Amino acid sequence: PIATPEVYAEMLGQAKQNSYAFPAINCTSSETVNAAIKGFADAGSDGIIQFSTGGAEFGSGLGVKDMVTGAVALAEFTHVIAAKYPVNVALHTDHCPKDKLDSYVRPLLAISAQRVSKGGNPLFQSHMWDGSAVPIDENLAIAQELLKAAAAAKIILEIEIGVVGEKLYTSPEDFEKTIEALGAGEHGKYLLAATFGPDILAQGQQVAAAKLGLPADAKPFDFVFHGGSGSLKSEIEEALRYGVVKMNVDTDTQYAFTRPIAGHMFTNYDGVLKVDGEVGVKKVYDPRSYLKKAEASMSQRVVQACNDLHCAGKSLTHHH
Amino acid sequence: PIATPEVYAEMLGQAKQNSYAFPAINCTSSETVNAAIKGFADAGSDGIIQFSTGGAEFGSGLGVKDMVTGAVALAEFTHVIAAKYPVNVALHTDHCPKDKLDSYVRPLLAISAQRVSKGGNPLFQSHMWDGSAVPIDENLAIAQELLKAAAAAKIILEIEIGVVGEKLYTSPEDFEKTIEALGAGEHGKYLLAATFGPDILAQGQQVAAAKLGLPADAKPFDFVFHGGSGSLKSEIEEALRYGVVKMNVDTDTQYAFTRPIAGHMFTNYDGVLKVDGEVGVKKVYDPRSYLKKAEASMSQRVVQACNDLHCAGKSLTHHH
Amino acid sequence: PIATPEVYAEMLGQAKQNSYAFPAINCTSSETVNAAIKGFADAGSDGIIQFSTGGAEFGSGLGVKDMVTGAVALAEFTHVIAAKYPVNVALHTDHCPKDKLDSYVRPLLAISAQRVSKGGNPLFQSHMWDGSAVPIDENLAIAQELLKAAAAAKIILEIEIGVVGEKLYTSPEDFEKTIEALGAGEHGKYLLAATFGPDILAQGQQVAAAKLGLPADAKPFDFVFHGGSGSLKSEIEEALRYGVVKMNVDTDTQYAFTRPIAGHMFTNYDGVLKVDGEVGVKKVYDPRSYLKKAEASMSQRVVQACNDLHCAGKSLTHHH
Amino acid sequence: PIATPEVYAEMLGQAKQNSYAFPAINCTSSETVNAAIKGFADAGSDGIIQFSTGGAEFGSGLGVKDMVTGAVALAEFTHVIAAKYPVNVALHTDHCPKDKLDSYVRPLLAISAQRVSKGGNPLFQSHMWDGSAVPIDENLAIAQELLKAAAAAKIILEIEIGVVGEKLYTSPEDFEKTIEALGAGEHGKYLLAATFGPDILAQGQQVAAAKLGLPADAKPFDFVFHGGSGSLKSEIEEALRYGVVKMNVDTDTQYAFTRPIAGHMFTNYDGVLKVDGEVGVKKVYDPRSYLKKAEASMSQRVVQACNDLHCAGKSLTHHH
Numbered sequence A, B, C, D: 001p002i003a004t005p006e007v008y009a010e011m012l013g014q015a016k017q018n019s020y021a022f023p024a025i026n027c028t029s030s031e032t033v034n035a036a037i038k039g040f041a042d043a044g045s046d047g048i049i050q051f052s053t054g055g056a057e058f059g060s061g062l063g064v065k066d067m068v069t070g071a072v073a074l075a076e077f078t079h080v081i082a083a084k085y086p087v088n089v090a091l092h093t094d095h096c097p098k099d100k101l102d103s104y105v106r107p108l109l110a111i112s113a114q115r116v117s118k119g120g121n122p123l124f125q126s127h128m129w130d131g132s133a134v135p136i137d138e139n140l141a142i143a144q145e146l147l148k149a150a151a152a153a154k155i156i157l158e159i160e161i162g163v164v165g166e167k168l169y170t171s172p173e174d175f176e177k178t179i180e181a182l183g184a185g186e187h188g189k190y191l192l193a194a195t196f197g198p199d200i201l202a203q204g205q206q207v208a209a210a211k212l213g214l215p216a217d218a219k220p221f222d223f224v225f226h227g228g229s230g231s232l233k234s235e236i237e238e239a240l241r242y243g244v245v246k247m248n249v250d251t252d253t254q255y256a257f258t259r260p261i262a263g264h265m266f267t268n269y270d271g272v273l274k275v276d277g278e279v280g281v282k283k284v285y286d287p288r289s290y291l292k293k294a295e296a297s298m299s300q301r302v303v304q305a306c307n308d309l310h311c312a313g314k315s316l317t318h319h320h
């Protein structure tokens, strides 16, 4: 099923408590959503599906090019599919900068608040506010008002703190301001972006622990691993140790999805093309023929991600 | 928007009255649904989107393979998208034989009846019952009970009468039995499948007209043109003359969709593949890169279909 | 074997006498020479192999780029191969304009004159002088001195008369000047270029016949059909009627040669490329694997040419 | 130029004396011969071109399939080309087992003996007798009679001693029998095959040195490195130390030759194929278009080979 806000919070809490993480797979279509969920299920894992601003726009079609429409349409598709699987699937929106809040995250929040007001659950279970391009205080000011709105709609907020230089530098004062402005979850759960290539996360936890009068080994922050494509399956290990509960994946699953399509076109070149006055071969230019292969291949890469992140076999539905 | 049952009936009535038809495009995904709707809109046309049993199964993903799930999920996606366009889009299910009624058309009907009972509109606006493999009397017996259920859920029924030998032969008695069992629309609108390669349709109308005590030039039947891929844009003309209001399209739009994907893989062979120890090129193995081209190309072929069928420029929203 | 000057003259005389023609296949390599000869042999036909200035330069290799070297090297290769076949193969050089006579046709002539002076036969059996870019009188002046040199080395000269506008226009006076300057073969055999798209050849023969005091149906000229790629196998018929004894072929055999190579690369994409850290498949990146297919395919197209030109089955060796 | 027997012996002596080696490039065509020679020349190096039994058969064309014809035809081509370069090119035949001596090496030897008897030089400068499949004594018996014939035609003999298990094991007694039967060059120079993956060569030299009453560091054998594709450019170093004067290369140059052809077909897919009723693009299905790229790429790999083997910059023509 789709993760209810309650099981989503439980997923993240359990991951944090046991030093594992969920892959958060960028999806852009019915096929990629299907590959991602099947991958979670094959790994006996819960998981996260996320739509970027570009993915949402793509999802809405060339005739619309509206992020909200694309995200809503893909979310509604995903709700139907996920109900048929015995793992929990959370829906998320990726990087939304200041100039796109009004045309992406805010209208999506409003849709979920409307649903919650009628006794429903939100359409998405988390949204990312990416304020990295603005000064920290403005970043956290926006974050605070978004966090209140999100919490009230039963939605977790992801944020990104510090400066982008690609890698994300975050100072000890940035970590402190974040705890100060947002608290430690008691005003609504939130996730904090981070990159690697690592002890910065460790320092972030210690800084926050000190601020909160907590033992020096406490991990107040739930971290989100960005930019980890093909990363050292040892950096991943270390990332997990410092409280990463979510690792974003796109590049790796894109290659996995496209790879068999490429192979299909080459081996079936004279079926997918009308060559030398011939009429091609319907069975191989049928989009389902290569897109099933794309799906299965992406699902396999998602299974690998669940194993690398150690969430495989740990779905909260305990379907074993 | 999605066609309400009322505007769908109006669409078909207008087409019949003015000797034009709508293409009914097989779709299997978010991308293909997007291409189809954009095509209707670019042609200023209303249109029909249909899911085959195989397309629905594909739509549900390899991890589910459930026709109802796939059709529902794609329908929900399509409802969101279609609301953003100023043309009317009807949703349809294609060929459902006897052995699949219980796992496709019947559960879908029940979903729509539930929606209608709550004062809503049906999820789909038409369903096809393909009884061509059974004797005509059994075919029409099933058709009658399905027609009653469909009409009560504000859904139009498509049926296929006669024997498949590919082409569809339908005798004058088959046409007569059909009018006798089903009436002429007063017990619920229905569509009748037909093939070409043509005067058979003409004879069908005359036979039905005689039965109904109507003038010899009346056209009681609304016909559905099956198997018309790449057909003589002159057979199409003649088809229109005999009351075809819906022409099914799949092969042509499949080739249009796949063609640029093929071209993308070839020209970007060393970007979509990691070659000679290189790491490929993310920008071209990003599925959106070639799938946007696929979408645009399918939309173009759909525009052509609207022009060939003369529904281009005639959307009932009169957005000109 | 290679055509001796005597059998080459006999070949052309027989073709002219019986209204058939030989294809003259542009070749650029050992593989293309092999495909051409095998094609002649499979059709039980004599034939002509010709090297363009560009083909000769290509034949000499990127490190040399010398037309004479390339033509000589390919000719020597061809002498060895042709001795193993029971058909006669003539060697020819294609289009040589004024500015290239000193670096192509003239040095080649000198090589053959040297061989003849030692009691041998010439290396090539014909050479083309293409003077179409200069005024007719200069064209024929050069032609006359070249014809004397060629005849003395037992070589037939091909020339091109008239203006290029692509198609070749040749006036009745041009035909007359040609007979006047060169005679009708008694001062050395020569071939006259022509194009189609046809009665111009007919007029040329009548004009020459009148000049020579011959019956109105005589055909003094041996014509060479240039620019006939994919031509109407009815234009070919008419061409034959007017004294075409040689039809130049390049485009058609290029496509035939390349076509299976293309197919080989696509179907073996992950063998001819090292993909995803794999090492490729030696058996399919072995140049012989696809080049054998290229050869066989070009030979087939050459067989077709022999049949279209009616020289198939008529080799002067009468190996049946 | 082509290496005269005298400069070929000088090449090998110099290489041995200075611990370098020549690549011996398998070639199968005019294009591959051109790429190899251009590669030697670009590296300022002498080099060896060799024809395998399969390469020779391929060279003769599908219509002939005769090893002698193919080798002779390619050799004659190569004589013309090599005269235009300021490096020395030796011609060689690769692996000829017992059952093919009568249809490959022996007739080729006879051709060269005929040339030498008329005061000419041999057509080939070395031939390989591969007796590895027969018992050592039979191997060396054949080798002795072949060596006498070769020496008398001014040809160097390559032999292969020991058992194939792929790698070549050669015992100390095998090395001793070889020196005993053949001497150390005073009865005609010969080359001895060897593989790596290395001290076996060292032991071979010591064994031969002992037999000949030579200092323990003498290197009586001229070794030929077989099976060294992509080998450790450190094994190559060690190979050189033990008296390897010739390293056979095929796989590496095959991949280099084919690689750009593959790329050409993919990027020009709709030019090399007639697609969607189009007629293709002559400029890219012209075999010269991709074969020039193949040639240049193979030449580059040959330059690399000359550098790895340290013969680059050491051509005996001292054209600097």
Ligand SMILES: O=C(O)c1ccc2cccc(O)c2n1
Residues within 6 Å of the ligand: A160, A164, A166, A167, A168, A193, A195, A226, A227, A248
């Ligand atoms: O793919 C990403 O989301 C990604 C990639 C690189 C990054 C560098 C710094 C901060 C981020 O959020 C980054 N994010």
Ligand SMILES: O=C(O)c1ccc2cccc(O)c2n1
Residues within 6 Å of the ligand: B160, B164, B166, B167, B168, B193, B195, B226, B227, B248
């Ligand atoms: O594509 C089709 O739906 C199709 C194709 C061929 C047919 C022949 C007879 C009856 C049909 O419904 C047919 N339908």
Ligand SMILES: O=C(O)c1ccc2cccc(O)c2n1
Residues within 6 Å of the ligand: C160, C164, C166, C167, C168, C193, C195, C226, C227, C248
């Ligand atoms: O391929 C050719 O040789 C060719 C092609 C087109 C021509 C047009 C006029 C005259 C020629 O020799 C021509 N030749």
Ligand SMILES: O=C(O)c1ccc2cccc(O)c2n1
Residues within 6 Å of the ligand: D160, D164, D166, D167, D168, D193, D195, D226, D227, D248
């Ligand atoms: O490519 C070759 O010539 C080759 C390859 C592998 C071998 C193994 C043992 C002996 C040889 O001559 C070998 N030769």
Ligand SMILES: [Zn+2]
Residues within 6 Å of the ligand: A095, A226, A227
């Ligand atoms: Zn990021």
Ligand SMILES: [Zn+2]
Residues within 6 Å of the ligand: A318, A319, A320
């Ligand atoms: Zn459990």
Ligand SMILES: [Zn+2]
Residues within 6 Å of the ligand: B095, B226, B227
């Ligand atoms: Zn049908």
Ligand SMILES: [Zn+2]
Residues within 6 Å of the ligand: B318, B319, B320
């Ligand atoms: Zn209007």
Ligand SMILES: [Zn+2]
Residues within 6 Å of the ligand: C095, C226, C227
């Ligand atoms: Zn021409």
Ligand SMILES: [Zn+2]
Residues within 6 Å of the ligand: C318, C319, C320
């Ligand atoms: Zn005969």
Ligand SMILES: [Zn+2]
Residues within 6 Å of the ligand: D095, D226, D227
């Ligand atoms: Zn070997």
Ligand SMILES: [Zn+2]
Residues within 6 Å of the ligand: D318, D319, D320
């Ligand atoms: Zn020097």
